[PDB]
């Protein structure tokens, strides 16, 4: 079963906010270990762990100072081995983050690199002389504010950083650095990890000519990976990322993965044309296994929009393979971002049904299975530095990083002390304990939907074909071998009706969904889904 990843569902855990088992108010590995039974009960195929490596935590894990160890705040390496072993014992695959695009400035490589222009690791990072006027070498901007270049007095040069100043980008034009990062991945592969989520996978290479980016002409759409309030979105990003050379490196990376059968990779795409880039990076079977984009991580969410996304993707390379996600640690929770103007109890069910019925892999964010709304984090409680640069137009990512509601008790049973982010009040009555034995609650809807998905080959990796189901409905067929299923979704809060584009063999009941099939006319109540066998 070495193709488990091609259609499998992965449960993303944000370590800081899952479960605190030691008592410092911050989630740790042992808590995850304690809740692997819960995770397994979701009928998901595996997990993706956000960074838990040694880090100053200035970007909370994504500024890595030691690629081959666990930060004391999350526990130890042995703790991780225990977590991995128990997870394997439950039939769960374990994937972990890899942030090889950039390191913390506290990483030994950079500490050495910054001292002078001639040291062994001087070229392991991206250094450039200032312009004659002492200004940055080009117009590249940091996503987290300011120029992408920061001056260092030691070398009298600027160093590049797409994100924080404390996150210098690695110079992938230096083969030994590439190799060092590959080795860093190999370290974790040798420990038995089942795969990697590749942080900003298209960022790896930059234009060595350091050419200026062109601006986006007024009225054209901005990039999906950043809020429009961010000046980052004022230029087309062609030279600061997504270079051709990266393809070659991807092959190398894939080669490493090939040395360990059954392992996989999912790339995070941050690009002006995310679908196209995902196709490019996941094509050939010699590069990325799969990748996800921000197309379903933004504001549009109509059935017509989904149709546009699916159509657009189907026009790309057919050998490509997508991973779909409606929520993660970087965006507003799906129940709020998409379903703010919808029923808070009904909409997450049909949304997640759509997510689970799309052709591709799935990323399911912690709490999304509870239909958790975006939390309101007060100014004085803000932790994410990305929330302190564009306030209040953009308030950062803390809203989706609030602690997991296990019980409706004190601090949601997350911690015996005050957690690093405040527990959201509204989450308490949506807690796991309050929701576990409720068959009408979103959790069990998710369980049933994923078991249902698991019982049908067509919903694993079957082909997808859009069909006419009306303007206010989303409809398509999934086909593999004997089995052809018709999937119809009502994402609206109003009853909808359509003529069936194919012939139904039998109705398929799943997760207490209600739909009326009268001959050739199908009716769907508000926020309902319909699955059917096709003759």
Contacting positions for Mg ion (CB under 5 A): 20, 22, 24, 26, 28
Among 207, 280, 330, 369, binds ligand BGC (CB under 6 A): 330
Residue 398 lies near ligand BGC (rule: CB under 6 A): no
Measured from the CB atom, is 207 or 268 closer to ligand BGC?
Answer: 268
Query: By CB under 6 A, what part of segment 88-127 binds ligand BGC?
Result: 99
Residue 163 lies near ligand BGC (rule: CB under 6 A): yes
Q: State the nearest-atom distance from the C-beta of 291 to ligand BGC, in Å.
A: 12
Query: By CB under 6 A, what part of segment 198-217 binds ligand BGC?
Result: 199-200
The C-alpha angle with vertex 268 and arms to 265 and 274, in degrees rounded to 5, equals 125
Measured from the CB atom, is 290 or 529 closer to ligand BGC?
Answer: 290
Task: Give the distance from CA 79 to its chain's centroid.
Answer: 24
Measured from the CB atom, is 22 or 345 closer to Mg ion?
Answer: 22
Among 194, 207, 268, 280, binds ligand BGC (CB under 6 A): 268
> Rounded to an integer, what distance in angstroms lies between the CA atom of residue 147 and that of residue 163?
10
Binding residues for Mg(2+): 20, 24, 26, 28
Burial label for 8, CB within 10 Å (0-12, 13-18, 19+), is buried
Among 20, 28, 45, 59, binds ligand BGC (CB under 6 A): 59
Considering CB distances under 5 to 8 angstroms, the limit depending on partner class, which of ligand BGC, Mg ion, none binds residue 395? none
Measured from the CB atom, is 22 or 307 closer to Mg ion?
Answer: 22
Q: State the nearest-atom distance from the C-beta of 268 to ligand BGC, in Å.
A: 5
Binding residues: 20, 24, 26, 28
Residue 62 lies near ligand BGC (rule: CB under 6 A): yes
Measured from the CB atom, is 330 or 368 closer to ligand BGC?
Answer: 330
**Token digits of residue 120:** 């062994």
The H or E element spanning position 354 is: helix 347-357
What 141-148 contacts at long range (C-beta under 8 Å, 24+ apart), as own/partner pairs, is 141/231, 141/232, 141/234, 141/235, 142/232, 143/226, 143/230, 143/232, 143/386, 144/385, 144/386, 144/389, 145/389, 145/390, 148/240
Considering CB distances under 5 to 8 angstroms, the limit depending on partner class, which of Mg ion, ligand BGC, none binds residue 22? Mg ion
Query: By CB under 6 A, what part of segment 450-489 binds ligand BGC?
Result: none
> Rounded to an integer, what distance in angstroms lies between the CA atom of residue 415 and that of residue 420?
10
- The structure tokens 């044309």 sit at 273
> Rounded to an integer, what distance in angstroms lies between the CA atom of residue 258 and that of residue 514?
45
Considering CB distances under 5 to 8 angstroms, the limit depending on partner class, which of Mg ion, ligand BGC, none binds residue 330? ligand BGC
Among 161, 329, 359, 401, binds ligand BGC (CB under 6 A): 329
Query: Can you tell me whether residue 533 is helix, strand or coil?
Result: strand
Q: State the nearest-atom distance from the C-beta of 480 to ligand BGC, in Å.
A: 32
> Rounded to an integer, what distance in angstroms lies between the CA atom of residue 235 and that of residue 215?
4
**Helix, strand, coil: what percent of the chain each, to 5?**
30, 20, 55
Considering CB distances under 5 to 8 angstroms, the limit depending on partner class, which of Mg ion, ligand BGC, none binds residue 199? ligand BGC
Query: Which single residue brings its beta carbon nearest to ligand BGC?
Result: 62
> Rounded to an integer, what distance in angstroms lies between the CA atom of residue 27 and that of residue 19?
5
User: DSSP label at 167?
Assistant: -
Length of the chain: 535
Binding positions for ligand BGC, rule: CB under 6 A: 59, 62, 99, 163, 199-200, 268, 329-330
């Amino acid at each position: 079963n070495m193709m488990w990843w091609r259609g499998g569902v992965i449960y993303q855990i944000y370590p800081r906010s899952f479960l605190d088992s030691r008592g410092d108010g911050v989630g740790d590995l042992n808590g995850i270990t304690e809740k692997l039974d819960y995770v397994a009960s979701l009928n998901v195929d595996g997990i993706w762990l956000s960074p838990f490596f040694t880090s100053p935590m200035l970007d909370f894990g994504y500024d890595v100072s030691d690629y081959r160890d666990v930060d004391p705040m999350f526990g130890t390496l042995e703790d991780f081995k225990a977590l991995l072993e128990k997870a394997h014992s439950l039939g769960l695959k374990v994937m972990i983050d890899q942030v090889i695009s950039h390191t913390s400035d506290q990483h030994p490589w950079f500490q050495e690199s910054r001292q002078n222009r001639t040291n062994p690791k001087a070229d392991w990072f991206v250094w450039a002389d200032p312009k004659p006027d002492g200004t940055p070498p080009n117009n590249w901007l940091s996503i987290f504010g300011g120029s992408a270049w920061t001056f260092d007095s030691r070398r009298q040069q600027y160093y590049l950083h797409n994100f924080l100043t404390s996150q210098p980008d690695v110079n992938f034009h230096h083969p030994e650095a590439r190799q060092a990062q590959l080795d860093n991945m190999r370290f974790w592969l040798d420990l038995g990890v089942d795969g990697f989520r590749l942080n900003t996978v298209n960022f790896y290479f930059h234009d060595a000519e350091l050419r200026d980016n062109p601006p986006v002409p007024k009225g054209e759409a901005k990039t999906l990976g950043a809020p429009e309030a961010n000046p980052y979105t004022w230029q087309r990003h062609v030279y600061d990322l997504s270079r051709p050379e990266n393809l070659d490196f991807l092959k190398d990376l894939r080669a490493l993965m090939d040395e360990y059968p059954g392992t996989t990779t999912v790339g995070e795409i941050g690009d002006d044309n995310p679908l196209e880039r995902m196709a490019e990076y996941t094509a050939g079977g010699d590069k990325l296994h799969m990748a996800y984009t921000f197309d379903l991580l933004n504001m549009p969410h109509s059935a017509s929009y989904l149709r546009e996304v699916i159509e657009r993707f189907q026009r790309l390379a057919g050998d490509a393979w997508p991973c779909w996600a409606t929520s993660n640690h970087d965006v507003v929770r799906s129940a709020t971002r998409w379903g703010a103007d919808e029923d808070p109890h009904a909409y997450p069910k049909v949304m997640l049904a759509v997510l689970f019925s799309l052709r591709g892999s799935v990323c399911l964010y912690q709490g999304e299975e509870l239909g958790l709304p975006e939390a309101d984090v007060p100014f004085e409680r803000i932790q994410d530095p990305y929330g302190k640069v564009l306030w209040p137009e953009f308030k950062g990512r803390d809203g989706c990083r609030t602690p997991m509601p296990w019980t409706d008790g004190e601090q949601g049973g997350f911690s015996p002390v005050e957690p690093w982010l405040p527990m959201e009040a509204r989450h308490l009555e949506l807690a796991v304990s309050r929701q576990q034995d409720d068959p009408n609650a979103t959790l069990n809807t998710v369980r049933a939907l994923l078991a249902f998905r698991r019982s049908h080959p067509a919903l694993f990796d079957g082909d997808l074909s859009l069909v006419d189901v009306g303007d206010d409905l989303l409809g398509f067929t999934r086909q593999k071998g004997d089995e052809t299923l018709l999937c119809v979704f009502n994402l609206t809060g109003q009853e909808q009706q359509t003529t069936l584009p194919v012939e139904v063999a039998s109705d398929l009941p799943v997760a207490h969904f209600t739909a009326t099939r009268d001959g050739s006319t199908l009716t769907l109540p508000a926020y309902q889904a319909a699955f059917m066998q096709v003759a």
